[PDB]
Design a protein around this ligand. Structure first.
Ligand SMILES: CC[C@]1(O)C[C@@H]2CN(CCc3c([nH]c4ccccc34)[C@@](C(=O)OC)(c3cc4c(cc3OC)N(C)[C@H]3[C@@](O)(C(=O)OC)[C@H](OC(C)=O)[C@]5(CC)C=CCN6CC[C@]43[C@@H]65)C2)C1
Ligand SMILES: Nc1nc2c(ncn2[C@@H]2O[C@H](COP(=O)(O)OP(=O)(O)OP(=O)(O)O)[C@@H](O)[C@H]2O)c(=O)[nH]1
Ligand SMILES: Nc1nc2c(ncn2[C@@H]2O[C@H](COP(=O)(O)OP(=O)(O)OP(=O)(O)O)[C@@H](O)[C@H]2O)c(=O)[nH]1
Ligand SMILES: Nc1nc2c(ncn2[C@@H]2O[C@H](COP(=O)(O)OP(=O)(O)O)[C@@H](O)[C@H]2O)c(=O)[nH]1
Ligand SMILES: Nc1nc2c(ncn2[C@@H]2O[C@H](COP(=O)(O)OP(=O)(O)O)[C@@H](O)[C@H]2O)c(=O)[nH]1
Ligand SMILES: [Ca+2]
Ligand SMILES: [Ca+2]
Ligand SMILES: [Mg+2]
Ligand SMILES: [Mg+2]
Lengths: 440, 424, 428, 439
């Protein structure tokens, strides 16, 4: 049991959803038709992968997922793509008219027409679970559907499932692939509204992923396909703890007890390694020590911040592949000594480590190399605020001249909600500062 | 699909309207008979936006043609692609307009507007998901300018939440001596400010100056001007007609381009104007005052927002870099209180004939030069009460003419007020 | 028969519980199927202290296995002696406790607790003369910690005049890395101070040191840690399971080991320290045994005895050996460290011998000390707790289950009282 | 003829009691099945031995004894021992749980539920007596039942047999074999309470018996069986005068008259000689003079103390075997000059002497060599007060911190009963001090 339902919202959520589910199928040996020849328990079972895949009588393994978008063209690609047979039609939900990059339209005007249906389809999945753990919500900050509809859905999930946990995979907007001047408004609006409905939220900064793909993968002009594929390896490492079984493995629930000290401080920073091209992987075997020492390089982080100019409140290292406890220990030592790791006074301990012996995997036709071992670090640092800050600034620069707000008010929104948000965000920036202040 | 309903009212509206359907039909591989005969599936992915797919695999433009004086309509029905249109969508009058805005808007135009509305309604009800409307017209004549805006106002009542888009040709003495134009333009601009969502200002002064100084065609004809218009219209609708992620529909464009409701008048630009040129050259030219389809120097104002659209096979890396250079090198001419306000689309299908082209859509405060020039003229006639007869004749009052005067003054004031504003 | 009811709760409780039942089953000549196969009648004389007898002359451990998650049980069930336990005595849930004392004690735990008490009650009505209960659990998690202490409290209510004894594994950041363990531990010590008669403090910090420093196990596993716990648990329960004159039941032990009600936390010790798999070429001389068991390096709690004073000590020697020499060496130790035993409890060191040795050893010795130095263990936990609690860090995990922060303040207070009370008697 | 009922309380009492009755049997020629060929009156008698054994019409001689222990293990041994047929089930009383080395649990908690049963069984034996003289009570100071229950019983026996003598045999706690740190508590509690109810108590210090076994018997680590066989030699010597024809100490009352001038100072010191290893290869048979001298060596006392630094109030010499009056009187005058034997002024300096011609019977297979003559000295000397001082000092050491006191208070005893029992012992030490303060 302990199932997890995935909800992919808007283009980013959906496109990222495709990449993850493809990766999951590769990892568990599931084919595009849903058959998994290595699974004897036909029709049903209690295996680890069943937390993400349900089983039909015919032996099909169906993702515990829902795809939702306010227009059809992105999800149509799933309906016709290699994995179309993988999903039951009721899992792919589409409307006719999108939010037009307007939080207001996704939350109110358009969202209101399709929200009931989405919740019903989610109810049908939940009802198939013997022990529903929680939800995983993938969505962009900047789109009207990613922002406006997500927040509506999270409010409605809080009502229908109470305190059942909700984790968020959020695409933080970056100029290099942004599609709307208003993405800051949508980002602050969506973050405020979901802040109290979300238990833990993993931001991915598109500028950070863009830069890593150029530098580490030598991609001159990364596409969404480049980004979504690296973004997936992070999700797979946060989820592997639940999709695979092992002796040194740790469930995300234990990590969360350590990665969320206070209710609102629920935004961990993610780092993956090794991100290398086959051209450079050839003639190079990144050691457990090198990969770990990389998770502390301020340029291999999926959110642009300087972890050093701040204090750590938790560093959780989830390893995968040819890793053995002895090597992990030596590494953490070398790092602590020859590196800048300052923890807070209120955090006895500080490091949590785990190993998933299931090897790392790479999609045929990818730009990442098949390594024998990899590491994902989830760290709660007071430096993630450099992101809330930068975004908050863009917002304050436009709201002062009240730019583009006529589009939001024309759909019902009021200036108040725009200020109610800036204040929760100023509070969070203070909260992150106070959590680092030493004690008396 | 996401349908747009095209309406062209008047000679200019129908002339550039007709040229528009030729260019984009060609780009999508539709012949005069409605049959598709093209080489790429990209030409059909979004063809429902402007075309209805009837039975017989024939594509018919979703276009309504309107005029208060036939013949122009007749020439259009005879011109290339004339038989591609639906015969029921021809809606024309008899009394004509006589270059009189009041006749197009309050009298002759009104007695025919109901006939037009039935065609619009029929076309709209057929739409799976109506985007909104797209009108082509001049502001100097009577039908296009007068009935055109009346038609918009009537549409807006039935489709209050749809996008209203207009290609509007501004009058230039370099190209027309009807003398009364500045009256019809000013009364037209007064209406566009309140009732349209986004308006492309196609300034005849710029087309003449490009044909004369740049293209070197002394004494140029309407056919010459409309080659620039058709080029331009094709450019600014590229992202609406092909698969893409940026400004793929009229509302997303409006959200990126219109920061304040009234400041919705766009400066179009095109490069190259017609040896082949590179991506750096393409970028430099499209931001140069001499490639603007509106008589305005962008160095005389600041950009609120800009969309750039590159068409053809080229290095996306090269495009991104060159775009950053031009924003940085020209940082002073962009308002700092709208971060990341220049968006860039790249459609890999070039237009017919060129290997790559750039299209510029600017929301610049320098467009007040276009309105100031019209305003100057308007006052240079209304100050003598000249020709107030044609308009009062049809029962219009004294005020109206004055309200349009101060209303457009305000518009110029707002563009200025946001040009001078600072981030701190 | 003076029966004991054994309860094991949670992951640690069941893992060290199961190994305990495997170790003493072997010592008593019972096999995986519950059949007696021994060479001595000395093994069957008190067999009923821990085992029930059915038809088939089979022996069934008087043991209840409790957990809030379905694993662990499966593990125990498939273990070598998985089949000896009574099936009706497996009581488990599906939610789990998420290493959260509040879930074990107040919410998830409460749903399962009543069905546990029926099996406890079932086992107790079967006993001719019930001594009381013993529970194995850790204090750092949620089930053994939170639900474990709930079970003690509820069981005490039904049997207020029986001995309650626990084997309580103290958390150490050397062995685990879950940040809330000091919260669960402090909450649990407060309970144990109020509701148990005797608690053996089994400290994972000392188990780590023994394995890593003394036995040179550079990749220690819980299997290694539990090898020492089971050796220690067989040793400290020897007086209950074999004929003998001293500490032969839980109440007589409490009267000898607990001079003041709250001071009922024992330091176990064992000698020789051995790592499983290895073989003993030379046994140790009674002298060597005696010197070692009093040595700080052989204590199962990570506290230096030289930093405090012994109130009471029990020593249990097992194996064939000179009763005369044991006396001589025990006197030497007392005469040699006579400043470390309080002067106002005369003859406070008591010595037992049992002829049956434990598996693999020719000679062993088990130390049970009530030393004031146990305060260092509770001080260590207390320091970790305050580092977090003074900022209310991670508290939402507990308040979200209905706990108030006042209840944390009390647990810290009670534990600081306990520490200072040990300090009171050290300066006597 | 007057009978004596024996009462054995707790493990010490039962195991020592079990030792004595076997030795009584070997001395009187009573077989394990109760048949006594020497007995020629079948089914009845008023012989000296009938004071301890009654008779049945089937010729069975059964001890006039009652065993009581709150746990069954020890009494089970009696029920299955080699002398199981001697006793019948009604005289063997056991409980379920014991006093857990807790005087309060033996006296109040577990005592109250069994006191009336024990008294009933004792009444049943009592009704079969034509002239019951009283009781001999065997118990430890340190156990919960031996200390706590005994005091209750002693009290009830004074109520239901107000007109009877009560003798005690008391095991005094020694570290070498003790099993609870709290034994000094139990010792002072039971002494305080039984003191007013006991006419004469023989204290046997396990420490003394432990070292005599080591030194004289070559027993490396004496067990209870070793200790108890020696103790039975002493107990038997003291009661010999009740079970055989004679004229000294012939009834319980005569013990108090001869040994106890003061009621509270009723603790005579016992000394026994000679103790010879049975594993020894023949030994210089000691003379009357030599064994009489041995009575004034500390190493043969049942309580280590130094009678030189105290005063006598009474002395009884009991000889068994080849002894005639001339040699005793000639040994006495010798000792009286060689040794410092100082009686209290208000007391005649003199010895009461008793000779039993039957020599000591030794249990076959025991540790004690058979001898031709032995002697037990009973001396009421103030030197025995040393044992109260030792005991009381340990009590004071623990009580000052209230260590372990909560175990007693939890069983319904009050804290005041501690300082009260201690006060009585404070008074008892001063009584010894007054009576023996010349120097
Ligand atoms: C007996 C139970 C145990 O096996 C004991 C340790 C922890 N786990 C088993 C697995 C294990 C261990 N280390 C792992 C690293 C990655 C993945 C798995 C492991 C374990 C080991 O090295 O194998 C023998 C181990 C773990 C630690 C460990 C030692 C250790 O080996 C014995 N340390 C005691 C702590 C540690 O934090 C510390 O305080 O330094 C001593 C330590 O720091 C370093 C750099 O050594 C370290 C090592 C990863 C760092 C961060 C997290 N903390 C928690 C405990 C600590 C660890 C062994 C449970
Ligand atoms: N990393 C990543 N970002 C994406 C992807 N698709 C969109 N985005 C980002 O998402 C933001 C815009 O949101 P979208 O997902 O495009 O839009 P939407 O959520 O569907 O909302 P509407 O368009 O209003 O219906 C921009 O910052 C994009 O860069 C993707 O596949 N990967
Ligand atoms: N000489 C001798 N001393 C004994 C014997 N048994 C116990 N003792 C001593 O008596 C004290 C303990 O008294 P026990 O007889 O064990 O106590 P009990 O009467 O059984 O009391 P509880 O069992 O505690 O209720 C200790 O000092 C023992 O050393 C025995 O057989 N012989
Ligand atoms: N670029 C362009 N401008 C035109 C064309 N026809 C007319 N105009 C302009 O439009 C104005 C006259 O509008 P007109 O078509 O006569 O309006 P109508 O009476 O409503 O049909 C003049 O200022 C002309 O400059 C044309 O074909 N191309
Ligand atoms: N010595 C030992 N400690 C253990 C074992 N299993 C868990 N622990 C410790 O117990 C604590 C975790 O408690 P856990 O058993 O998971 O608690 P639960 O959630 O109530 O079942 C940590 O401090 C671990 O180090 C074991 O088999 N042996
Ligand atoms: Ca299966
Ligand atoms: Ca007779
Ligand atoms: Mg979308
Ligand atoms: Mg006993």
């Amino acid at each position: 049991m302990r199932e997890c339902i995935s909800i992919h919202v808007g283009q980013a959520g959906v496109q990222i959803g495709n990449a993850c589910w493809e990766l999951y199928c590769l990892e568990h040996g599931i084919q595009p038709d849903g058959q998994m020849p290595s699974d004897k328990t036909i029709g049903g079972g209690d295996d680890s992968f069943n937390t993400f895949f349900s089983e039909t009588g015919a032996g099909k393994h169906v993702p515990r997922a829902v795809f939702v978008d306010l227009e059809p063209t992105v999800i149509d690609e799933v309906r016709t793509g290699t994995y179309r047979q993988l999903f039951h039609p009721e899992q792919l939900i589409t409307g006719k008219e999108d939010a037009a990059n307007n939080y207001a339209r996704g939350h109110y005007t358009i969202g209101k027409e399709i929200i009931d249906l989405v919740l019903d389809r989610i109810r049908k999945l939940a009802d198939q679970c013997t022990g529903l753990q929680g939800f995983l919500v993938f969505h962009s900050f900047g789109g009207g559907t990613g922002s406006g509809f997500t927040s509506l859905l999270m409010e409605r999930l809080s009502v229908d499932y109470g305190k059942k946990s909700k984790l968020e995979f959020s695409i933080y907007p970056a100029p290099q692939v942004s599609t709307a001047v208003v993405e800051p408004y949508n980002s602050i609006l969506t973050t405020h509204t979901t802040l109290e409905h979300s238990d833990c939220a993993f931001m991915v900064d598109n500028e950070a992923i863009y830069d890593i793909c150029r530098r580490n993968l030598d991609i001159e002009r990364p596409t969404y396909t480049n980004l979504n594929r690296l973004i997936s390896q992070i999700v797979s490492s946060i989820t592997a703890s639940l999709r695979f079984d092992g002796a040194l493995n740790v469930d995300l629930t234990e990590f969360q007890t350590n990665l969320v000290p206070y209710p609102r401080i629920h935004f961990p920073l993610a780092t993956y390694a090794p991100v290398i091209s086959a051209e450079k992987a050839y003639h190079e075997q990144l050691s457990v020590a090198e990969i770990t020492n990389a998770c502390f390089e301020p340029a291999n982080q999926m959110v642009k911040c300087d972890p050093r100019h701040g204090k750590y409140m938790a560093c959780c290292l989830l390893y995968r592949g040819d890793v053995v406890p002895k090597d992990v220990n030596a590494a953490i030592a070398t790092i602590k000594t020859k590196r800048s790791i300052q923890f807070v006074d209120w955090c006895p301990t500080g490091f949590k480590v785990g190993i998933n012996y299931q090897p790392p995997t790479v999609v045929p036709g990818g730009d990442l190399a098949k390594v024998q071992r990899a590491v994902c670090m989830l760290s709660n640092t007071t430096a993630i605020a450099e992101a809330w800050a930068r975004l908050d600034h863009k917002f304050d620069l436009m709201y002062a001249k009240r730019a583009f707000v006529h589009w939001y008010v024309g759909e019902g929104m009021e200036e108040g909600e725009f200020s109610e948000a800036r204040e929760d965000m100023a509070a969070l920036e203070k909260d992150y500062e106070e959590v680092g202040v030493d004690s008396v | 699909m996401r349908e747009i309903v095209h309406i062209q009212a008047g000679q200019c509206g129908n002339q550039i309207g007709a040229k528009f359907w030729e260019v984009i039909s060609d780009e999508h591989g539709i012949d005069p008979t409605g049959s598709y005969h093209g080489d790429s599936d990209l030409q059909l992915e979004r063809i429902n936006v402007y075309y209805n797919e009837a039975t017989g695999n024939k594509y018919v433009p979703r276009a309504i043609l309107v005029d208060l004086e036939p013949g122009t309509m007749d020439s259009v029905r005879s011109g290339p692609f004339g038989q591609i249109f639906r015969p029921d969508n021809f809606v024309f009058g008899q009394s004509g307009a006589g270059n009189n805005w009041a006749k197009g808007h309050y009298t002759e135009g009104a007695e025919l507007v109901d006939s037009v509305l039935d065609v619009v309604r029929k076309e709209s009800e057929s739409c799976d998901c109506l985007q909104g409307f797209q009108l082509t017209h001049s502001l100097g004549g009577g039908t296009g300018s007068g009935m055109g805006t009346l038609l918009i106002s009537k549409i807006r009542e039935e489709y209050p939440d749809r996008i209203m888009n207009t290609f509007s040709v501004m009058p230039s003495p370099k190209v027309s001596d009807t003398v009364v134009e500045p009256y019809n333009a000013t009364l037209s601009v007064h209406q566009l400010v309140e009732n349209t969502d986004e308006t492309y200002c196609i300034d005849n002064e710029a087309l003449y100056d490009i044909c004369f100084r740049t293209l070197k065609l002394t004494t140029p004809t309407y056919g010459d001007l409309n080659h620039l218009v058709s080029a331009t219209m094709s450019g600014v609708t590229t992202c609406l007609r092909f698969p893409g992620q940026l400004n793929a529909d009229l509302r997303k464009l409006a959200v990126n381009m219109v920061p304040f409701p009234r400041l919705h008048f766009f400066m179009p630009g095109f490069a190259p104007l017609t040896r082949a040129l590179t991506v750096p050259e393409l970028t430099q030219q499209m931001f140069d005052s001499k490639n603007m389809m509106a008589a305005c120097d962008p160095r005389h104002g600041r950009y609120l927002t800009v969309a750039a659209i590159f068409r053809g096979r080229m290095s996306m890396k090269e495009v991104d870099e060159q775009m950053l250079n031009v924003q940085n090198k020209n940082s002073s001419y962009f308002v700092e209180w709208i971060p990341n306000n220049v968006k860039t689309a790249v459609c890999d299908i070039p237009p017919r004939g060129l290997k790559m082209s750039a299209t510029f859509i600017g929301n610049s405060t320098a467009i007040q030069e276009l309105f100031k020039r019209i305003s100057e003229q308007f006052t240079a006639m209304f100050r003598r009460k000249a020709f107030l007869h044609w308009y009062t004749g049809e029962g219009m009052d004294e005020m109206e003419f004055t309200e349009a005067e101060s209303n457009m003054n305000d518009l110029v004031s707002e563009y200025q007020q946001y040009q001078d504003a600072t981030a701190d």
